[PDB]
């Protein structure tokens, strides 16, 4: 006989899975709390979304008040203080956050990072976003600057 390792299926939404005999356990960090089913960490505390990681620290606060799942599944390199490195949802991937089951929902990057478009209008799209330039202007290579 062997125990099933349920953690292989990434059952713990926004949490860490710990296998156990006959079951599994989801653990939440201090910015979240378990739902009734004990498989989803519901975000309770916002924190800083960092655009970069350098040496042993995180830099460039792009928004001081983001949901970790929103930050980390889109434009953030890291989140919080002290910070931890962002990983996209293993099921939904970049641009989306996992809500329940394998259900993914679009992240609005224009809300995660107000000002992501340096001199244009941020326009959210499903799975990404784009910068809309003033009339007569076009985007640079990075897509964030209008010229
Ligand atoms: Ca198990
Ligand atoms: Ca989006």
Author numbering: 1 to 147
The authors write:
The fibrillins and latent transforming growth factor-β binding proteins (LTBPs) form a superfamily of structurally-related proteins consisting of calcium-binding epidermal growth factor-like (cbEGF) domains interspersed with 8-cysteine-containing transforming growth factor β-binding protein-like (TB) and hybrid (hyb) domains. Fibrillins are the major components of the extracellular 10–12 nm diameter microfibrils, which mediate a variety of cell-matrix interactions. The molecular organization of the fibrillins, and the related LTBPs, is dominated by calcium-binding epidermal growth factor-like (cbEGF) domains. Related domains, the hybrid (hyb) domains, which have sequences similar to both the TB and cbEGF domains, are found near the N termini of these molecules, with two being found in each of the fibrillins (Corson et al., 2004; Pereira et al., 1993; Zhang et al., 1994), and one in each of the LTBPs (Gibson et al., 1995; Giltay et al., 1997; Kanzaki et al., 1990; Yin et al., 1995).
